[PDB]
Scaffold this motif. Sequence first.
Motif, PDB file in Angstrom:
ATOM      1  N   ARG A 156     -51.737  26.924 -20.906  1.00 25.73           N
ATOM      2  CA  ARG A 156     -53.506  26.989 -20.476  1.00 25.73           C
ATOM      3  C   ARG A 156     -53.339  26.288 -19.147  1.00 25.73           C
ATOM      4  O   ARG A 156     -54.406  26.396 -18.366  1.00 25.73           O
ATOM      5  N   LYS A 157     -52.787  25.091 -18.739  1.00 34.88           N
ATOM      6  CA  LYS A 157     -52.761  24.165 -17.634  1.00 34.88           C
ATOM      7  C   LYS A 157     -51.882  25.182 -16.370  1.00 34.88           C
ATOM      8  O   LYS A 157     -52.529  24.796 -15.264  1.00 34.88           O
ATOM      9  N   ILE A 158     -50.974  25.887 -16.901  1.00 34.83           N
ATOM     10  CA  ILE A 158     -50.228  26.599 -15.727  1.00 34.83           C
ATOM     11  C   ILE A 158     -51.249  27.938 -15.384  1.00 34.83           C
ATOM     12  O   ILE A 158     -51.452  28.302 -14.212  1.00 34.83           O
ATOM     13  N   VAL A 159     -51.944  28.650 -16.424  1.00 32.78           N
ATOM     14  CA  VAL A 159     -52.627  29.497 -16.169  1.00 32.78           C
ATOM     15  C   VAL A 159     -54.306  29.291 -16.555  1.00 32.78           C
ATOM     16  O   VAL A 159     -54.606  29.090 -17.646  1.00 32.78           O
ATOM     17  N   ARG A 160     -54.907  28.972 -15.342  1.00 32.22           N
ATOM     18  CA  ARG A 160     -56.335  28.403 -15.339  1.00 32.22           C
ATOM     19  C   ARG A 160     -57.491  29.468 -15.883  1.00 32.22           C
ATOM     20  O   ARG A 160     -57.964  30.038 -14.927  1.00 32.22           O
ATOM     21  N   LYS A 161     -58.080  29.378 -16.852  1.00 29.50           N
ATOM     22  CA  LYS A 161     -59.151  30.212 -17.339  1.00 29.50           C
ATOM     23  C   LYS A 161     -59.742  29.775 -18.513  1.00 29.50           C
ATOM     24  O   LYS A 161     -59.416  30.140 -19.651  1.00 29.50           O
ATOM     25  N   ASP A 162     -60.341  28.613 -18.533  1.00 29.81           N
ATOM     26  CA  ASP A 162     -60.701  27.674 -19.537  1.00 29.81           C
ATOM     27  C   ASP A 162     -61.627  27.914 -20.547  1.00 29.81           C
ATOM     28  O   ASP A 162     -61.880  27.603 -21.740  1.00 29.81           O
ATOM     29  N   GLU A 163     -62.362  29.253 -20.462  1.00 28.38           N
ATOM     30  CA  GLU A 163     -63.325  30.177 -21.399  1.00 28.38           C
ATOM     31  C   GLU A 163     -62.579  30.804 -22.389  1.00 28.38           C
ATOM     32  O   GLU A 163     -62.984  31.208 -23.426  1.00 28.38           O
ATOM     33  N   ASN A 164     -61.213  31.287 -22.265  1.00 29.35           N
ATOM     34  CA  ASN A 164     -60.404  31.865 -23.041  1.00 29.35           C
ATOM     35  C   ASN A 164     -59.484  30.902 -23.718  1.00 29.35           C
ATOM     36  O   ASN A 164     -58.857  29.933 -23.033  1.00 29.35           O
TER      37      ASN A 164
END
Lengths: 300, 237
Positions: free
Chosen positions: A127-135
């Motif tokens: 989730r730190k490499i792929v940034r979309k914090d709502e999912n």
Amino acid sequence: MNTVPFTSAPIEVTIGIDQYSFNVKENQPFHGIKDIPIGHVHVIHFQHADNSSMRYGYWFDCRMGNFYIQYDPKDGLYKMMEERDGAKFENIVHNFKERQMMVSYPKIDEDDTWYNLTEFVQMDKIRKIVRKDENQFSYVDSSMTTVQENELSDPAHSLNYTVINFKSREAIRPGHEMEDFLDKSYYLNTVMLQGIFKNSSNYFGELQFAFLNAMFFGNYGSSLQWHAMIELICSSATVPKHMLDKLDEILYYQIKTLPEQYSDILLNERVWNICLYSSFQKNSLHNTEKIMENKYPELL
Amino acid sequence: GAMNSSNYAELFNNDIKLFVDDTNVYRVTVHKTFEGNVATKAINGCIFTLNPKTGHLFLKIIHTSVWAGQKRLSQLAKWKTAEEVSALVRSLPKEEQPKQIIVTRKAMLDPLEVHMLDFPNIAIRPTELRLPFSAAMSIDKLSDVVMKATEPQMVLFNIYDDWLDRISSYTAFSRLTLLLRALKTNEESAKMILLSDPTITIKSYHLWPSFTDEQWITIESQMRDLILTEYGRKYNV
């Protein structure tokens, strides 16, 4: 064991779940994947029958919430969604299981393959490499560029891998140019391990995640990052023994899992010849050297 | 990228550039030991750093002491060359720093690029030109200063003497490359051509004799003949 229900399958698609894959026909009564092993990250991935353009998929962990797939006829893709209503989710899963409309995650009891490929991979690091914090899950596809590819363009849709560049002020201490260029130990141990990753587990996590995105999506930047992270260890004279032993295991299962017919696009001749035969660690990768020599001797 | 015959005029434009040649940095004689093994003995070397527009030569003398107790000397020599060119650039005022450094050998690219990371706007380039800068040590006054050095030293020369008073830097570079090619191909014959007439001398502040314009034509023709004669001798053609 946990479940990812599908609302429906309105378009013909090849569905991947980790290292497995299944063809679904257009409007087939497919309602998802059951018996997904708890304790690991997973990836559910897609390639449309009518347009092999954009392999895309979702990294998720069933411990983090209840996730389903619904086709969006506007954006033209299978979307992951979180179901926040516990009892609705249990009731949807139950109906689909009872009517036997789900495929079973087909795990052989002897088979540690997925654990061996994801040993160090954790959803919080993805989730730190792929940034979309709502999912709580992470979308990756064929064409997503890395922060490093974008330096050499929409930063929101990028893979924020750790930049590794052998000819950068980060990699070379002033006054130690020859030393640091020929022996990457400084760069690996002080800058990357102590400095940015904090430990070898986080470094191996990103390496393993890079490999899986290269293999499952044909993501070119991911392949570059996987090779860069291998070459950084192999080009270092001083590496903890536990790290070299663990790297050999990691690479062995990656090379074991790679489809034979994708070796020409997924494996960089220069990097592997250098790592196996010329580098400081040319004698530290016995298992990886043996499978590479027996399965892909044409590359070497 | 790489510098060739297509972009040859680029050498004589107003963008400061330097050629760097590392051939004469690490120099040895090979000899038998008492036990009948073979051993090298290093001699003084030099870095050949040249501005082709101005003729300014930055001759960095590499004293044999820099090899003492070092290993893999052919590899170290590339990195010591890169270290010294990097130090020369940092020593020059900003408006004198090159915008490009052209290496005569591709093996200098990574060492020089890594030493010059602090200068991202200085392009490091190879060349497809075969430049006879290895023959610098055939120029008596350059050979003399290198072999007499008892310590690391930098010596500054104009390799065109006063030629730019009479000819362009294109023609001066053409003349230098022809003289160095001749000295590289047949050193004895080239020096004989340059010194045969005792009435034409080398000024104390020059490297080459004081040829009139008509005499440079004759010398240049004799140099071309020498190169052609040696080509015939080599290939029996």
